Amino acid sequence: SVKSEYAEAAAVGQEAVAVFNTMKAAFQNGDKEAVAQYLARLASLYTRHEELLNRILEKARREGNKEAVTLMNEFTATFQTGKSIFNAMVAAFKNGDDDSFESYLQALEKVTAKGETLADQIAKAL
């Protein structure tokens, strides 16, 4: 159902959380090779997480679940902000700008957190 599809999206979000936390540690340690690999893995997880969210949103629209659609519209707007900042962080790493990278790392943590109270609401709505 849409709810098992939501359990998969939740699991991918958690896989990104885990990889992001190992990537931040590697950045702090100066292990640039490792960071470059984690960033590739995160970019993929964004691609897969987005695909699941798109499929959840479309099923809610077709099902007429107005409250789920509202909440999913809001969350995917937050998620998109995350994507834009993630691209900025990748571009900072490419450029060798650790100052900007550190900042973007902090910003992305706030986007994830600011969307969590919505993520919990959607499930109760689906």
Ligand SMILES: O=c1ccc2ccc(O)cc2o1
């Ligand atoms: O799919 C995601 C969700 C959150 C997230 C947060 C940080 C990141 O680097 C990648 C991420 O991918």
